[PDB]
Subunit: 52 residues, 4 copies
Protein backbone atom coordinates (compact mmCIF):
# COMPACT_ATOMS: atom_id res chain seq x y z
CA UNK A 1 0.00 0.00 0.00
CA UNK A 2 2.29 2.72 1.30
CA UNK A 3 5.11 0.47 0.07
CA UNK A 4 3.68 -0.79 -3.23
CA UNK A 5 3.04 2.71 -4.57
CA UNK A 6 6.12 4.30 -2.98
CA UNK A 7 8.09 1.56 -4.76
CA UNK A 8 6.05 2.16 -7.92
CA UNK A 9 6.69 5.91 -7.77
CA UNK A 10 10.34 5.18 -7.00
CA UNK A 11 10.86 2.95 -10.04
CA UNK A 12 9.28 5.58 -12.31
CA UNK A 13 11.31 8.47 -10.89
CA UNK A 14 14.64 6.63 -11.03
CA UNK A 15 14.10 5.49 -14.62
CA UNK A 16 12.72 8.90 -15.62
CA UNK A 17 16.00 10.50 -14.51
CA UNK A 18 17.95 7.99 -16.60
CA UNK A 19 15.69 8.50 -19.62
CA UNK A 20 15.64 12.29 -19.31
CA UNK A 21 19.41 12.48 -18.85
CA UNK A 22 20.13 10.25 -21.85
CA UNK A 23 17.57 12.14 -23.94
CA UNK A 24 19.06 15.57 -23.20
CA UNK A 25 22.50 14.20 -24.12
CA UNK A 26 21.13 13.01 -27.46
CA UNK A 27 19.37 16.36 -27.93
CA UNK A 28 22.68 18.15 -27.29
CA UNK A 29 24.73 15.92 -29.60
CA UNK A 30 22.27 16.26 -32.50
CA UNK A 31 22.26 20.04 -32.06
CA UNK A 32 26.05 20.13 -31.69
CA UNK A 33 26.88 18.06 -34.77
CA UNK A 34 24.21 19.77 -36.88
CA UNK A 35 25.48 23.20 -35.85
CA UNK A 36 29.01 21.98 -36.61
CA UNK A 37 28.05 20.68 -40.05
CA UNK A 38 26.43 24.01 -40.91
CA UNK A 39 29.46 26.12 -39.99
CA UNK A 40 31.66 23.76 -42.02
CA UNK A 41 29.22 24.02 -44.94
CA UNK A 42 28.84 27.80 -44.70
CA UNK A 43 32.61 28.26 -44.49
CA UNK A 44 33.27 26.04 -47.52
CA UNK A 45 30.70 27.79 -49.71
CA UNK A 46 32.16 31.15 -48.71
CA UNK A 47 35.60 29.84 -49.67
CA UNK A 48 34.49 28.44 -53.04
CA UNK A 49 32.64 31.63 -53.98
CA UNK A 50 35.61 33.76 -52.89
CA UNK A 51 37.94 31.60 -55.02
CA UNK A 52 35.94 31.64 -58.27
CA UNK B 1 -3.00 -4.56 -6.99
CA UNK B 2 0.41 -5.94 -7.94
CA UNK B 3 -0.75 -6.06 -11.56
CA UNK B 4 -2.57 -2.73 -11.34
CA UNK B 5 0.62 -1.15 -9.98
CA UNK B 6 2.78 -2.78 -12.66
CA UNK B 7 0.46 -1.52 -15.40
CA UNK B 8 0.78 1.95 -13.87
CA UNK B 9 4.59 1.78 -13.97
CA UNK B 10 4.76 0.55 -17.57
CA UNK B 11 2.19 3.10 -18.71
CA UNK B 12 3.78 6.10 -16.98
CA UNK B 13 7.29 5.24 -18.17
CA UNK B 14 5.93 4.53 -21.66
CA UNK B 15 4.54 8.07 -21.84
CA UNK B 16 7.99 9.41 -20.90
CA UNK B 17 9.83 7.28 -23.45
CA UNK B 18 7.44 8.13 -26.28
CA UNK B 19 7.56 11.86 -25.49
CA UNK B 20 11.37 11.90 -25.51
CA UNK B 21 11.46 9.77 -28.67
CA UNK B 22 8.98 12.09 -30.38
CA UNK B 23 11.01 15.23 -29.65
CA UNK B 24 14.20 13.57 -30.91
CA UNK B 25 12.40 12.36 -34.04
CA UNK B 26 11.29 15.95 -34.64
CA UNK B 27 14.74 17.37 -33.90
CA UNK B 28 16.46 14.97 -36.31
CA UNK B 29 13.94 15.80 -39.03
CA UNK B 30 14.20 19.55 -38.43
CA UNK B 31 18.00 19.70 -38.49
CA UNK B 32 18.16 17.35 -41.49
CA UNK B 33 15.61 19.47 -43.36
CA UNK B 34 17.64 22.60 -42.58
CA UNK B 35 20.78 20.87 -43.86
CA UNK B 36 19.16 19.77 -47.13
CA UNK B 37 17.81 23.29 -47.72
CA UNK B 38 21.20 24.81 -46.89
CA UNK B 39 23.12 22.47 -49.20
CA UNK B 40 20.75 22.97 -52.14
CA UNK B 41 20.70 26.75 -51.65
CA UNK B 42 24.50 26.94 -51.62
CA UNK B 43 24.99 24.68 -54.64
CA UNK B 44 22.45 26.73 -56.58
CA UNK B 45 24.50 29.81 -55.69
CA UNK B 46 27.73 28.18 -56.86
CA UNK B 47 26.17 26.97 -60.11
CA UNK B 48 24.90 30.48 -60.91
CA UNK B 49 28.39 31.89 -60.21
CA UNK B 50 30.58 29.52 -62.26
CA UNK C 1 6.00 -15.73 -7.58
CA UNK C 2 3.61 -12.83 -8.11
CA UNK C 3 6.51 -10.48 -7.33
CA UNK C 4 9.12 -11.94 -9.69
CA UNK C 5 6.56 -12.66 -12.42
CA UNK C 6 5.35 -9.05 -12.41
CA UNK C 7 8.94 -7.76 -12.36
CA UNK C 8 9.93 -9.84 -15.39
CA UNK C 9 6.78 -8.55 -17.10
CA UNK C 10 7.62 -4.90 -16.40
CA UNK C 11 11.14 -5.38 -17.79
CA UNK C 12 10.07 -7.24 -20.92
CA UNK C 13 7.25 -4.86 -21.82
CA UNK C 14 9.26 -1.67 -21.34
CA UNK C 15 12.25 -3.22 -23.14
CA UNK C 16 10.06 -3.66 -26.23
CA UNK C 17 8.96 -0.03 -25.92
CA UNK C 18 12.58 1.12 -25.74
CA UNK C 19 13.84 -1.16 -28.51
CA UNK C 20 11.02 0.04 -30.78
CA UNK C 21 11.86 3.69 -30.12
CA UNK C 22 15.58 2.94 -30.51
CA UNK C 23 15.33 1.05 -33.80
CA UNK C 24 13.07 3.77 -35.21
CA UNK C 25 15.52 6.57 -34.38
CA UNK C 26 18.37 4.41 -35.69
CA UNK C 27 16.49 4.13 -38.97
CA UNK C 28 15.67 7.85 -39.13
CA UNK C 29 19.29 8.85 -38.47
CA UNK C 30 20.59 6.41 -41.09
CA UNK C 31 17.95 7.51 -43.60
CA UNK C 32 18.56 11.25 -43.23
CA UNK C 33 22.33 10.71 -43.22
CA UNK C 34 22.05 8.58 -46.36
CA UNK C 35 20.04 11.29 -48.13
CA UNK C 36 22.46 14.05 -47.13
CA UNK C 37 25.40 12.02 -48.42
CA UNK C 38 23.62 11.40 -51.73
CA UNK C 39 22.52 15.03 -52.06
CA UNK C 40 26.06 16.26 -51.40
CA UNK C 41 27.76 13.86 -53.81
CA UNK C 42 25.11 14.53 -56.46
CA UNK C 43 25.41 18.30 -56.06
CA UNK C 44 29.22 18.23 -56.12
CA UNK C 45 29.36 16.17 -59.32
CA UNK C 46 26.84 18.63 -60.78
CA UNK C 47 29.13 21.56 -60.00
CA UNK C 48 32.19 19.74 -61.35
CA UNK C 49 30.39 18.85 -64.57
CA UNK C 50 29.40 22.51 -65.02
CA UNK C 51 32.80 24.16 -64.49
CA UNK D 1 16.74 -5.19 1.85
CA UNK D 2 13.06 -6.05 1.56
CA UNK D 3 12.04 -8.30 -1.32
CA UNK D 4 10.19 -5.41 -2.96
CA UNK D 5 13.25 -3.17 -2.53
CA UNK D 6 15.59 -5.73 -4.11
CA UNK D 7 13.02 -6.41 -6.85
CA UNK D 8 12.60 -2.70 -7.59
CA UNK D 9 16.40 -2.38 -7.68
CA UNK D 10 16.56 -5.21 -10.23
CA UNK D 11 13.85 -3.66 -12.40
CA UNK D 12 15.68 -0.32 -12.48
CA UNK D 13 19.06 -1.94 -13.12
CA UNK D 14 17.93 -4.18 -15.98
CA UNK D 15 16.08 -1.31 -17.66
CA UNK D 16 18.98 1.08 -17.04
CA UNK D 17 21.28 -1.31 -18.90
CA UNK D 18 18.78 -1.37 -21.78
CA UNK D 19 18.37 2.41 -21.85
CA UNK D 20 22.11 3.08 -21.62
CA UNK D 21 22.94 0.58 -24.38
CA UNK D 22 20.35 1.97 -26.79
CA UNK D 23 21.59 5.45 -25.88
CA UNK D 24 25.24 4.50 -26.41
CA UNK D 25 24.43 3.02 -29.82
CA UNK D 26 22.59 6.17 -30.91
CA UNK D 27 25.49 8.25 -29.59
CA UNK D 28 27.96 6.27 -31.71
CA UNK D 29 25.58 6.33 -34.69
CA UNK D 30 25.17 10.11 -34.69
CA UNK D 31 28.91 10.68 -34.29
CA UNK D 32 29.60 8.19 -37.09
CA UNK D 33 27.24 9.75 -39.64
CA UNK D 34 28.37 13.28 -38.78
CA UNK D 35 31.98 12.16 -39.23
CA UNK D 36 31.11 10.50 -42.54
CA UNK D 37 29.46 13.69 -43.80
CA UNK D 38 32.44 15.83 -42.77
CA UNK D 39 34.84 13.47 -44.56
CA UNK D 40 32.71 13.72 -47.70
CA UNK D 41 32.32 17.49 -47.46
CA UNK D 42 36.04 18.08 -47.02
CA UNK D 43 37.02 15.75 -49.86
CA UNK D 44 34.55 17.56 -52.13
CA UNK D 45 35.61 21.10 -51.20
CA UNK D 46 39.24 20.24 -51.97
CA UNK D 47 38.13 18.75 -55.29
CA UNK D 48 36.10 21.83 -56.22
CA UNK D 49 38.87 24.23 -55.20
CA UNK D 50 41.37 22.30 -57.33
CA UNK D 51 38.93 22.28 -60.27
CA UNK D 52 37.85 25.94 -60.51
Amino acid sequence: GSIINETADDIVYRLTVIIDDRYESLKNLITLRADRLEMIINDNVSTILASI
